[PDB]
């Protein structure tokens, strides 16, 4: 059922919100709200600001601090946000202290599963689609190989079709060297080495053929 | 295939900003004595970007682990950028008053900029009020 948001902060929900904040940061409150099926953006942000943020404090005030507080009250009359700032505390808590001084789970688990799923899924659709295409492509390739290999076993040698070249100057790199930038001309002689490496190459090819 | 596009009203900002980050990056590399990698410049420029946003917010950009010289340099460059922005905004608003040809999108942009500018001004006044009494 669709409805108007609000309610009360269940601890699991709070935890989820915290996680979101770690993920997306303190200025994308829409996304975090979306992550919570019950609670609004504004609600969420407020909660983070007021209760949930770890760079707040809820430790009791020293006698000096009490003095500072009540003195502020005396001097700044009920401008409690300002007062809070002065204290260096969140405002509601300060107010409460001042006042003191003067005198179901299936649903929750659903959003959890969804939440964890989201947070562990950090890529735009382009990415997902791309990896999908990659694995599909791989599958296609192996299937093709299986055909080719099958035919070889059968006795019909089929050369693998090239990639249908996208443009006139598209390169196949096995045809010939990519952009043979040769080594710097030889000061020390290199002839024997050239031979040996050539032999090694040819030998490798032979091995592959036999393999 | 030597297309190279000119600047125009439509792509002016993007070009500006790329030029800026190139300049900043260069300066930081000049400064940096280890001769660090491009990947270590990514951290730098990303840092810069965050700084810019912080300035936009009027939240002071005080990252602890930096070297002071870098912090200085970035502060400078965002001041330059900021200057460019604010003046541009001012020019736009006079332009809008005049009733000139101006992009619907551009006018919205100017509204946004001027709002942020206003908020920054305002909360600076609040700070002032705090810092030296009523």
């Amino acid at each position: 059922p669709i409805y108007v948001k609000g309610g009360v902060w269940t601890n699991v929900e709070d935890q989820i919100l915290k996680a979101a904040v770690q993920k997306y940061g303190t200025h994308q409150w829409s996304k975090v709200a979306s992550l919570l099926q019950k609670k609004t953006a504004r609600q969420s942000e407020l909660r983070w600001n007021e209760y949930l943020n770890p760079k707040l404090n809820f430790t009791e005030f020293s006698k000096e601090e009490d003095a500072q507080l009540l003195d502020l009250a005396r001097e700044l009359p009920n401008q409690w946000r300002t007062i809070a700032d002065m204290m260096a505390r969140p405002a509601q808590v300060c107010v409460e202290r001042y006042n003191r001084l003067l005198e179901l789970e299936d649903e929750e688990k659903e959003m959890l599963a969804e939440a964890r799923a989201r947070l562990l899924n950090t890529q735009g659709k382009k990415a997902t689609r791309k990896i999908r295409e990659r694995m599909l492509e791989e599958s296609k390739r192996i299937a093709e190989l299986q055909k080719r290999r099958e035919l070889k076993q059968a006795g019909i040698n089929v050369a693998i079709k090239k990639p249908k070249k996208k443009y006139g100057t598209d390169i196949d790199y096995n045809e010939d060297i990519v952009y043979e930038q040769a080594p710097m001309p030889g000061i020390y002689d290199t002839s024997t080495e050239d031979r040996q490496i050539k032999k090694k190459f040819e030998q490798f090819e032979r091995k592959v053929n036999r393999k | 295939n030597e297309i190279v596009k000119t600047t125009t009203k439509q792509r002016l900002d993007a070009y500006y900003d790329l030029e800026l980050r190139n300049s900043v990056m260069d300066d930081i590399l000049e400064m940096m004595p280890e001769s660090i990698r491009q990947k270590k410049a990514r951290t730098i420029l990303q840092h810069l970007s965050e700084a810019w946003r912080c300035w936009k917010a009027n939240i002071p950009w005080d990252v602890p682990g930096m070297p002071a010289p870098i912090k200085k340099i970035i502060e400078r460059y965002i001041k330059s950028k900021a200057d460019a922005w604010v003046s541009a905004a001012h020019y736009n608003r006079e332009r809008i008053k005049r009733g000139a040809h101006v992009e619907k999108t551009m006018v919205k942009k100017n509204l946004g900029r001027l709002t942020r500018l206003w908020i920054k001004n305002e909360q600076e006044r609040q700070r002032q009020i705090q810092k030296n009494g009523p």
Binding site: - | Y15, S35, R76, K79, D83
Partner: protein, 342 residues
């Protein structure tokens, strides 16, 4: 062999120059004054290119804003009045190299071609041909009359922060971020010789007037180079000073270097002797990183330095006419020797 050379150095004496003081300050622009260039025919007015894009022309004598010029879109990174013919070239990050005509105060000819936000223009002294180079890492050469690029001096492997056009065979000195400098067989389309004696961005170069040489800057070191052979001439004492933005040399062998620290350096061009440091001031409201001299040039006289600082200020500097070898000598020159270049 080091001891010999050191001994020789100590034997010689770098001459005394009069020191400098902040004569005039102009809070003219509403941005950084990244370009400054002064009319070499008359020594009357000098223009300065802001980040605003409005390059503003300034009389020296009065100091007043002679007139604004605003044909560009993005920061006018460099300008260059041609003494040879009455054409103020300029250039922005908008990739334009617009040629103004001062006989009309409008722009005349644009030079399209540049792939990326061009950093510097230099006009050829003995031709109607101008050189320009930017992030493209390419120093192009424009025939003015016909407004085509004639030739493109490819070579540099990184943006090309300065350029200087000379009259000789090495017609171009291309100073890049690539930690190099190049001299070019312009006719060939080839670097005749490539000096590389820099650790960092070679991002401030200047031709000496009556010497036929060119000083260049790095992050600290400031070589000075003799461009006949394509040879080094002199290392300098810039060992602790900042990243050099600009490097305008005086007529009287008084090589200037502008610090990203903010500190105005001052060298005897012949020797290298740092004969004055001067920590600049910022405008009252500025931040402490902003005091950074981003531009500089001397007049025809050589008795007025002009500096485009990032405090949106166009500071000007006189040599002290009350100065002597006893009243303000230099900074007691000493070649350091600590595994040094001298």
């Amino acid at each position: 062999l080091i001891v010999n050379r050191y001994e020789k150095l100590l034997s010689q004496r770098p001459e005394w120059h009069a020191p400098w003081k902040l004569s005039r300050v102009i809070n003219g622009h509403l941005g950084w004054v990244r370009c400054v260039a002064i009319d070499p025919v008359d020594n009357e007015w000098f223009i300065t290119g802001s980040n605003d894009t409005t390059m503003k022309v300034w009389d020296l004598a009065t100091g007043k804003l002679k007139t604004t010029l605003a044909g560009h879109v993005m920061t006018v990174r460099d300008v260059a009045v041609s003494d040879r013919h009455p054409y103020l070239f300029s250039v922005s990050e908008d990739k334009t190299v617009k040629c103004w005509d001062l006989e009309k105060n409008q722009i005349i000819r644009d030079y399209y071609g540049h792939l990326s936000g061009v950093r510097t223009v230099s006009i050829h002294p003995t031709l109607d041909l101008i050189a320009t180079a930017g992030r493209d890492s390419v120093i192009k050469l424009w025939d003015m009359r016909t407004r085509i690029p004639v030739i493109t001096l490819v070579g540099h492997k990184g943006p090309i922060n300065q350029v200087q056009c000379t009259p000789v065979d090495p017609q171009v000195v291309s100073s890049s971020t690539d930690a190099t400098v190049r001299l070019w067989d312009v006719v060939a389309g080839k670097t005749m010789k490539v000096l590389t004696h820099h650790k960092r961005s070679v991002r401030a170069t200047a031709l000496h007037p009556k010497e036929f040489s060119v000083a260049s800057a790095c992050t600290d070191d400031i070589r000075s180079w003799g461009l006949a052979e394509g040879s080094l001439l002199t290392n300098f004492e810039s060992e602790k000073t900042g990243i050099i933005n600009t490097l305008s040399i005086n007529q009287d062998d008084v090589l200037f270097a502008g610090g990203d620290n903010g500190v105005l350096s001052f060298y005897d061009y012949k020797s290298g002797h740092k004969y004055q440091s001067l920590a600049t001031r910022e405008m009252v409201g500025s931040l402490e990183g902003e005091r950074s001299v981003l531009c500089s040039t001397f007049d025809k006289t050589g008795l007025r330095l002009i500096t485009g600082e990032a405090d949106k200020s166009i500071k000007i500097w006189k040599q002290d006419e009350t100065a002597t070898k006893e009243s303000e000598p230099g900074l007691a020159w000493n070649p350091n020797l600590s595994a040094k270049r001298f």
